[PDB]
């Protein structure tokens, strides 16, 4: 299939949960997206490894607890530190996510299911 688009993904650090974001992953396959998926417990830098490696459109973070949702922001900063910030969109999503916590931290983009994810992301392109 013609890639659409590419996107990095990553369960953020100190978060082992990875089920939903599998999904995720998945659905955005079936449209067309080329998908990297990192893995878990994703520390900032290694997103920013990710970004200058890959050259994605877009950069998706998943967070099941709420003790790890802080290093979303973690991350951006990174992305920020790194030049990286203005070349991506970043997503965000998991069960404690909300789009009042995107806009907190600066994201550019929350959704609340893998469906709705595929729609954010061909709206961010």
């Given at each position: 299939?013609?890639?659409?688009?590419?996107i990095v993904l990553g369960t953020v650090k100190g978060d082992l949960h990875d089920i939903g974001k599998n999904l995720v992953a998945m659905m955005l396959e079936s449209g067309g997206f080329t998908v990297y998926n990192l893995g878990v417990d994703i520390e900032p830098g290694k997103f920013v490894e990710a970004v200058k490696?890959?050259?994605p459109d877009i950069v998706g973070m998943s967070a099941l607890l709420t003790t790890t949702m802080m290093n979303?922001?973690?991350?951006?900063?990174?992305l920020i530190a790194a030049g990286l910030r203005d070349?991506?969109?970043?997503i965000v999503?998991?069960?404690?996510?909300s789009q009042d916590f995107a806009d907190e931290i600066g994201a550019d983009g929350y959704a609340p299911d893998?469906?709705?994810?595929?729609?954010?992301c061909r709206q961010l392109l």
């Amino acid at each position: 299939m013609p890639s659409v688009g590419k996107i990095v993904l990553g369960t953020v650090k100190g978060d082992l949960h990875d089920i939903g974001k599998n999904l995720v992953a998945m659905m955005l396959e079936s449209g067309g997206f080329t998908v990297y998926n990192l893995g878990v417990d994703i520390e900032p830098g290694k997103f920013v490894e990710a970004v200058k490696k890959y050259q994605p459109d877009i950069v998706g973070m998943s967070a099941l607890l709420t003790t790890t949702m802080m290093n979303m922001k973690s991350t951006i900063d990174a992305l920020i530190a790194a030049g990286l910030r203005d070349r991506v969109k970043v997503i965000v999503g998991g069960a404690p996510l909300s789009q009042d916590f995107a806009d907190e931290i600066g994201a550019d983009g929350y959704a609340p299911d893998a469906a709705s994810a595929t729609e954010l992301c061909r709206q961010l392109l």
